[PDB]
């Protein structure tokens, strides 16, 4: 959660500036940041753990839509809150299969 | 050697005897055949060739380390090393591994197997003796998983000549 | 085969599975391996060919006459001949006898064996499994000598591939 | 060799192949392995040397006299001697007998075996194959006890390399 | 272990028992010896060494993937790995594979074999027992391929000590 | 398995049975153990391990291809791969190969052998049985090479338990 | 089994464990392997089936009459028949006898063996271990002939997996 | 061969016989099976194949050298060479190693084992014989560790045919 | 084969028979099993497999050459090639080597052994026979080392069927 915003040029600050380029104004709520961090820590724990890199993977999966439609949304302002994140980050990565090899 | 594990009431236990025998003669009666792995958060008990057992154990530990210590995944990857062309030499030993989630038995030939329902595993020459006493104890008693293990091991020990009464019981709070 | 005997509260029970195998295939699943002898005063169980048994059951009747219905006297005698009589060493089997004061096991080799302070005996490939179940049940439960034998057969039969579920329980009186 | 027996609707049938092998080569394909005994009142089948059989068929006649044509009484008796009589344990073979009330199998080892509620028996290297065919046919079809045995021999003979197609079916009455 | 497959009426089925036995003792009775491969569009059942079977299975799956999932071609390429100088270690196991087009049995020694006419395959210790019951059922009944499989497996199970009644039947619509 | 070849009147024939047996049980009775190689201008029949036979066959075919399909030269080069330091694994199988010029038998151990005079070859368990019937037929009859082969195979089949009557006869016009 | 005998200060002691095993499993732990014979004048120990022993203990009584209670005369005689009498060579066991003037060991093979100037004898799988303990204890300590046998059994029983701790020490007078 | 070690009163001893036998014949009776390593500050005694023993010994010495001569660590690293994929050939021999701190026995199969309490080790055919005499001597005497070793070796030698009386005893002041 | 060596009075001799036998039949009776190495200043005699012996001999000769021909050092370096990981194939043969300083016997398994006192060595099937005659001759006679060798070889030859009378005796002035 802190890596997401505190550091100079954090991921949240980068995407804010990237979208601002297309004339879009975005803002992450405290709750939103918290879910992005939970999801990241969650998949590093259930699958392969890549550390803080996972944040990049998740943000990209989250900023997927806006990054594409930003040019068509000039002048607007987007609010990335809890709901926006729960929708964007679908549900539980992908299975957990492994019993295929067990007797 | 006898090793048995019972899981009930959110408690997991794995215990075993201490007799080490060379042929028909005993060498040591105080061996610890059950030990804790991965920051002491996973129980493991072994049976078979003294050297083969330790190497099966060790090989498994390296696995837990290369993963987030996930019992299942680890067991599957270790077993995969036998399911290839490079005929990874087989080990004449077996392991019982458990933690807060699952319980498995892994063999030096390359396969992983899960319990059945009553969450009971047992390996070694005296295995099936402790196994029966335990199934019985579980389907007709309210005894703790820790009590069932000690009681079944003792029983097994009074039947198998290669199983003594010097137990080592580990449980995962 | 699995024949187990449990004595608890003036009650002596003897039960057994009913599987007859020829190598690794089933020949018969509904078999009686426990018969009532000496005018329904002495229940016995066998683990071998019925004929082999019948030949020894009739002969235990004879020996039980030379001596006053003394199970032990009659037993110790049988085994003394089973090993000496050249025709008897032909018949290979295990024998379990009970009546009202004691239980025993007769072998075509060693000789008579009496129960411990637990009053339990078991023979047959699955014997030791049933034994383990019983010894646990009789030391931790209040189940009847009949409800115990009942369960022990189930447990053994599930581990031994030469034992089934068709039980022939013979109580007494 | 394959000898199978099926009883369905007061009808008792017994059929068998006719191959006589010496190691891995055929010696004779047209052989009678099912004979009519006790004044055509008791049909029997053998799986061994005809001489060995004849010696036991004549002896089953004798035992069937000591007792009132009681197939079982006579049978249980034969096996009691086959194992005790030193000359009889010389003859190795399998025996199947049927008459009008029951079917049986006599072994030079264990002893008599009665059919299940299906009334089917089979012996010989291909026995279990014929048994499997029959048990299915009698539980899913209305075919005659004779049309069943017929087919079962064909099926077995096609899987066993020691069984052929020349059948000797003996019905009754 | 027993595995059998029947193909009739545009329907393909492959089923098997669940008994896993170590020596003459059972370890698990609920194993799934039949599974779906290639996006669940091909049926596969295995028998033999627990580890060898899985590695034979796995090796085959990699094949289906390197082709458009064509059963025949895949079977032939896998078998080709045994028909060279590099003595690819042999596996003591066998596989039965099928789909909407064909049914084959592949062995860990390197050969592929097709049915005969009635489209019936069977492998394992109990194989030929289910095989007969099935041939019989197919040449004398109108029962579904799914019904024949379950009925034959059961039969086989009542004959082979290493085959239980906990089936896993897969069919390809 | 039985394979025999006769060459007379400018005609070359090579035929064989179809029985494939696993142990003492048949698996398939319609196998083609004789096939055409090199643009269908050379006859080849094999016996022995199902997998070893195919690999011996295949290895030989590659040879014919690396030469102008010359039977002799090919046989000699293939056999040369066993007569070196690199102990090319041996195959437990045998091949009979022929064409408009010669007839040879090649073994998985590395040697080539030619007929004797009557141009007759035969391999497999049933080989010598068809061999005699053929020598006899050739030194006392005017029967075609195609007739002799079919007649001898049949004979062989009635003697060897691993040789059936489902023949596959190939002749080279 | 372990039976050891030590004579020190007109005191002759004979003790033994009480374990009866069937292969590698315990059948009975509380067994008497040392009996009082010849009107409590001759203590003996056996290492075999009790029946086998009883048959030889009664026979040593007979031989001890033909000669004036002369342990040796009676012994040397028994072994002379045990090897000559065809029925006796059937009984395999080890025998140890002591009375008041000497100790001996009777074998169904070689023959009688007398102690050295140490007056110690031992038989049974664990014999040599008990022997080693005793020989050391009697040559470096002042412990009673009874306190020695006591310890020697403990030592042996701890090394031999076929010997336990339930001792049956028979002193004299 | 017999090798035994006792540690008491701040004294460590390790001694052994001198008989070298080829089959059932002696070759040399004055061999030194106990020697000093690492600047003569660690005792080592070996048993088993003459060549395998020396190579086990030598391999261990290289270890002590690559460390500060720490017995434990060295033993563990040597044993680790057997607990890997590279199946380091196994040696049919055993070593007993000791110094001012610990005593261990190492085997050519790859495992290290520590005493029990009385600090006594023994290996070789005559091992358990010296072992008993020593346990006995230690739990009932005040004899020096040097005296116990010589006395037990002698005893062992009078029992095992492959153990003579030409000892070599080394002690670490 | 028989080879013996005696060293007395500043004289060293090494001689042997000449019989070369294939199975139970002789092939040659005039073989030279004793030869001179290193500028004819070291005696060597061999026994065992004809090919293994020569290769053991040859391997040793290369050693003497890589050193100043020092018997001991050479023997130790050759033996070192067996005490490593690279399992240098073992040779089923033995060598007796001597010179003005020492006498040793080296085996194809990797160990060197020195005499005892009377400086006598002997290897081969007939070895111990010549050995006794020599020990005897040395501890009770004044006969030359050359005389003892010839006399003992002859004796050995009259006892062992694989040892003839065609000797080859070499001595080092
Ligand atoms: Mg025990
Ligand atoms: Mg069962
Ligand atoms: Mg057939
Ligand atoms: Mg079954
Ligand atoms: Mg045939
Ligand atoms: Mg013990
Ligand atoms: Mg000795
Ligand atoms: Mg001679």
From Swiss-Prot, chain A:
TM segment ranges: none
Protein residues bound to ATP: 53
Superkingdom of source: Bacteria
UniProt-annotated location(s): Cytoplasm
Family in the record: Belongs to the ClpX chaperone family. HslU subfamily.
Subunit record text: A double ring-shaped homohexamer of HslV is capped on each side by a ring-shaped HslU homohexamer. The assembly of the HslU/HslV complex is dependent on binding of ATP.
Cited function: ATPase subunit of a proteasome-like degradation complex; this subunit has chaperone activity. The binding of ATP and its subsequent hydrolysis by HslU are essential for unfolding of protein substrates subsequently hydrolyzed by HslV. HslU recognizes the N-terminal part of its protein substrates and unfolds these before they are guided to HslV for hydrolysis.
Record protein name field: ATP-dependent protease ATPase subunit HslU
Natural source organism: Haemophilus influenzae (strain ATCC 51907 / DSM 11121 / KW20 / Rd)
Swiss-Prot record, chains B, C, D, E, F, G, H, I:
E.C. designation(s): 3.4.25.2
Subcellular location: Cytoplasm
Reactions this protein catalyses: ATP-dependent cleavage of peptide bonds with broad specificity
InterPro entries: ATP-dep_Prtase_HsIV_su, Ntn_hydrolases_N, Proteasome_sua/b, Proteasome_suB-type
Residue stretches spanning the membrane: none
Positions of the catalytic residues: 1
CDD domains attached to this UniProt entry: protease_HslV
Keywords, alphabetical: Allosteric enzyme, Cytoplasm, Hydrolase, Metal-binding, Protease, Sodium, Threonine protease
Top-level class of the enzyme under EC nomenclature: hydrolase
GO CC annotation: cytoplasm; HslUV protease complex; proteasome core complex
Key word Protease present: yes
A biological-process GO annotation: proteolysis involved in protein catabolic process
Activation and inhibition: Allosterically activated by HslU binding.
Binding residues annotated for Na(+), in chain numbering: 157, 160, 163
Top-rank taxon: Bacteria
GO terms for MF: metal ion binding; threonine-type endopeptidase activity
Family: Belongs to the peptidase T1B family. HslV subfamily.
Assembly and oligomerization: A double ring-shaped homohexamer of HslV is capped on each side by a ring-shaped HslU homohexamer. The assembly of the HslU/HslV complex is dependent on binding of ATP.
Free-text function comment from the UniProt entry: Protease subunit of a proteasome-like degradation complex believed to be a general protein degrading machinery.
Name of this protein: ATP-dependent protease subunit HslV
């Amino acid at each position: 959660e802190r890596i997401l915003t505190e550091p100079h040029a954090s991921l949240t600050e980068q995407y804010k500036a990237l979208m601002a380029t297309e004339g879009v104004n975005i803002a992450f709520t405290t709750d939103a940041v918290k879910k992005i961090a939970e999801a990241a820590f969650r998949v590093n724990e259930k699958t392969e753990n890549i550390g803080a890199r996972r944040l990049h993977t998740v943000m990209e999966r989250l900023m997927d839509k806006i990054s594409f439609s930003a040019s068509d949304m000039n002048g607007q302002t987007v609010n990335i809150d809890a709901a926006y994140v729960a929708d964007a980050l679908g549900e539980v990565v992908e299975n957990e299969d492994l019993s295929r090899f067990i007797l | 050697t006898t090793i048995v594990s019972v899981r009930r009431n959110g408690q997991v236990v794995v215990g075993g005897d201490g007799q080490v025998s060379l042929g028909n003669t005993v060498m040591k009666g105080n061996a610890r055949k059950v030990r804790r792995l991965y920051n002491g958060k996973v129980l493991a008990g072994f049976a078979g060739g003294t050297a083969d057992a330790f190497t099966l154990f060790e090989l498994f530990e390296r696995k837990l380390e290369m993963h987030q210590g996930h019992l299942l995944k680890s067991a599957v990857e270790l077993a995969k090393d036998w399911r290839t062309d490079r005929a990874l030499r087989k080990l004449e030993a077996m392991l019982i591994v458990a933690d807060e989630k699952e319980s498995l038995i892994i063999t030096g030939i390359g396969d992983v197997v899960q319990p059945e329902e009553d969450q009971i595993l047992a390996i070694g020459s005296g295995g099936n003796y402790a196994l029966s006493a335990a199934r019985a104890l579980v389907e007709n008693t309210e005894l703790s998983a820790h009590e069932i293990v000690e009681k079944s091991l003792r029983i097994a020990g009074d039947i198998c000549v290669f199983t003594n009464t010097n137990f080592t019981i580990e449980e995962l709070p």
